[PDB]
Amino acid sequence: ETLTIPEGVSVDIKARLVTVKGPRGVLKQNLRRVDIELKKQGNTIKFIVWHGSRKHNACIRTAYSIINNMIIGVTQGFRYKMRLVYININLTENGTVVEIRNFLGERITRVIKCLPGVTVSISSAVKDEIIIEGNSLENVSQSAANIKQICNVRNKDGIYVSERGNIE
């Protein structure tokens, strides 16, 4: 199990920290999670476990997934498409904030502050579709999770989500 390094992505290990770089920016999140020594040769990251336990076997795979998620997000998008199935649904807000309106006839207007690095384009190319863009899958999906979690039906049909993808 060895994970390589792209042409231009500069991963640096500073006390279980990762600070990959790219044209999309710097994707750095704290990684105080893995108790496994990390070997970096400058082009490929190697994970070696010396007489580890079952938790070590979980740590190596989780670390590989996290670094794989970051290596996907160095310069590629994590666009998350939604679906507005329904009294109609309208979303009018600027910046990195998303507000709901006419949610099943409720007069209230739910307000959600998107996580940093998440861009909303309020696309009108396709019907009842809103996409969430970013480089960090964790932040993008957490923002999408918060958007859908606040859109819940109590004592009712319903509202569902759409697929994922990559942009740029």
Place this chain on the structure above:
RNA sequence: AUGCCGCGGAGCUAUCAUCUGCCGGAUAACGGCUGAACGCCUCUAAGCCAGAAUCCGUGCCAGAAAGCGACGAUUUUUUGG
């Protein structure tokens, strides 16, 4: 031993009269995200949000009489400093 009666200012008093009585964080159950384990899946193992009249705070009351700070003047030509 306030003789009795009507009204009676002031005071007191009446849910018999009038005025006033907020929002921040952390959570429980629970719901999600990135995600392994157990080559997949799954909220959980690390981590992150949301979330109760809950808990702790802001506000309100008292002020350690052995907690503290800033400021003011320092027995008058007798005397004390």
